Amino acid sequence: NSYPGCPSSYDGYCLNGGVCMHIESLDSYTCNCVIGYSGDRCQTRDLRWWELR
């Protein structure tokens, strides 16, 4: 099932358009940024993704 999202205990570590992923079994957790979101987690919201388009 992979259970999309992540233990609500989170609801705050993923930054700027950071998809909160959740691998089952190992009940571990992670995140993913995008085309304008990077840096540590994804605090890098710069002139890229949105580009004000």
Which DSSP state fits 31? E
**CA–CA separation, 52 and 5 (whole Å):** 27
Residues 6+ apart with CB under 8 A from 18: 31, 32, 33, 37, 41, 42
The neighbouring-strand residues paired with 34 are 37
**Residue ranges of E strands in 1-53:** 19-21, 30-32
Nearest by Cα to 34 from 52, 14, 53:
14
The token duo for 46 is 């710069």
- Domains of the chain, first to last: 1-53 (2.10.25.10)
Nearest by Cα to 21 from 36, 42, 39, 35:
42
**CA–CA separation, 47 and 35 (whole Å):** 10
**How determined?**
NMR
